[model samples]
Target: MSNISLIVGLGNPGSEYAQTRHNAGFWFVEQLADKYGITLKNDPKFHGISGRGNIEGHDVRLLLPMTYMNRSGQSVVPFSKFYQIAPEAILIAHDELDMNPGVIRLKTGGGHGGHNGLRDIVPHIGPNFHRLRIGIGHPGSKERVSGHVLGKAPSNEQSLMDGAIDHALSKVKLLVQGQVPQAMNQINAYKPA
Candidate 1:
């Protein structure tokens, strides 16, 4: 398990953005909150909604940036600075257009793959944070990318996405306990039918 102190979910704020593929990251934090019974509250000082809870007997924070997608870093940095958390101690959950709907991957210290939220975040926080990429699948053409990410998934895909989230949730304890390799193994091994 990694000594992950903070878990951030990247998404644009507002009901309009809810259920869109772009909000997959937000979905992740929500699932964690539900499972842990953490009530996220608006924290204007943090530029987001945030809550604290324990996972695997370790204290952790959950943040959902309300700065909208492109300005995600604005919310994340304050918490890091305040808690003295390093970039590597944060876990970011966000949508991945390159992967299929049922896929979720864990990675660390990589460049943002054309994700505006991550692009903005990298400069402020550096590039060493862990990423939990939740796949939403891509539209066939580049032109459709924006619409695809900002739009809702079809019902079938939506269900599969929920399952993916659940699978990721199952591995959260391992991550919190600093058993990252084991968590990675379980996460990467999952295959959705």
Candidate 2:
């Protein structure tokens, strides 16, 4: 059997940062924890909330780093090290502007694409980990992009995001079951009807 896989959901921590577009990653992980009846309480070293549960019978550790978005790497490296999970064996879920709303793309060994969270992760863990990109859509102008991700999704998109989180939770199960390629294919093929 493959060693344990860690799902590191990247985002800032706090109620002030909750439910924002930039927090899609955090939301995705939270959904998994909730569904599995796991609690994500704070850990001093991790500087994040972490929980463990059986995902498809595989022991899975879910992390939502409290290091804040831009400095996400510092906390992730320690957790990854403690868990002894290789970079390639880890999966990161985060928001992506390149894709449209409700679209989730799975990738490996690539650039950060200007995302601060990924930027920090790649430098420490290297670029070979799986990335689960939850689309936030570009806010048109660059300046607006910052405000857009940091703020709430429109009321219409909020509902979609909620459903999207449910969808992502299933895919995460597929991944832990050694079905990453199949999981990505399943998720990307989906569309709201």
Candidate 3:
């Protein structure tokens, strides 16, 4: 129940996937890095880009796993192990297709709900880390799910998602202070205006 010590953003590496909806997690960590003045750089030991800095008065480590989406845990486990961080002290930001664009939800330790990123993370670290589910409106029908997530969203959806990211960013101070309920209260109710 302590403040999150590590924030792992899930995403596939390379410019090809950079703007896709699947990289929502990457966007969150990138925003966090910019806001907190953290410089992320490629780190082989961590299997991704890594940085350390202070955020809202709490020291935190930011990770963008470049090991690709299906093997995210490969990056997270090593980075977390090196820092001696436990599951409870980690927060994972990932895309959520169940909700509409601009919506967000925060929770700790749940089933991956078929998300490849979250699914891969669980077996390696156990289902005890926090999850920041950034909404990405789903494409109609299960047949289009893969294409929808891997493709770039329309500009309107992208704007809404950007707004959601800022809203979530504004609430991190509360989360870092261990005010989960307060943070969740504000975040879960947010809608881009």
Q: Give the top-scoring candidate (lDDT).
A: 3
How do the residues 77-161 of candidate 3 rate in per-residue lDDT, one tens digit apiece? 8888888999988889999999889999998887899999888889888998899999998899999999999999999999999
- The stretch of ten residues in a row with the least summed lDDT in candidate 1 is 1-10
lDDT of 3: 0.91
C-alpha RMSD (angstroms) for model 3: 0.9
Each candidate structure's TM-score, on Cα atoms with residue i matched to residue i, is 0.97, 0.94, 0.97
Per-residue lDDT value at 174 in model 3? 86
Kindly give the number of clashing pairs for every candidate: 4, 0, 0
Model 2, span 1-193: residue lDDT tens: 2332888888888899997899999988888888888788888788888988887778888899899999898889989998888987888999998877867778877899999999888888789888888888898998898899899888887766666667777777678887777887987776655
- Clashing pairs for model 1 are 1-178, 1-179, 1-180, 2-178
lDDT of 1 by residue, 1-193 (tens): 3588899999989999998999999999998988898889999998999999887788999999999899888889878899898887889999999988889998888899999999988998899989899999999999999999999999998988888889999999888887788888888777896
Q: Between 1 and 2, whose lDDT is larger?
A: 1
User: Model 3, which residues run further than 4 Å from truth?
Assistant: none
Q: Candidate 1: global Cα-lDDT? A: 0.90
Cα deviation in Å at residue 102, candidate 1?
Answer: 0.4
Candidate 2 off by > 4 Å = 1-4
Cand. 3 TM to true fold: 0.97
Question: How high is the lDDT of residue 73 in model 3?
Answer: 86
On the 0 to 100 scale, the lDDT of residue 162 in model 1 is: 82
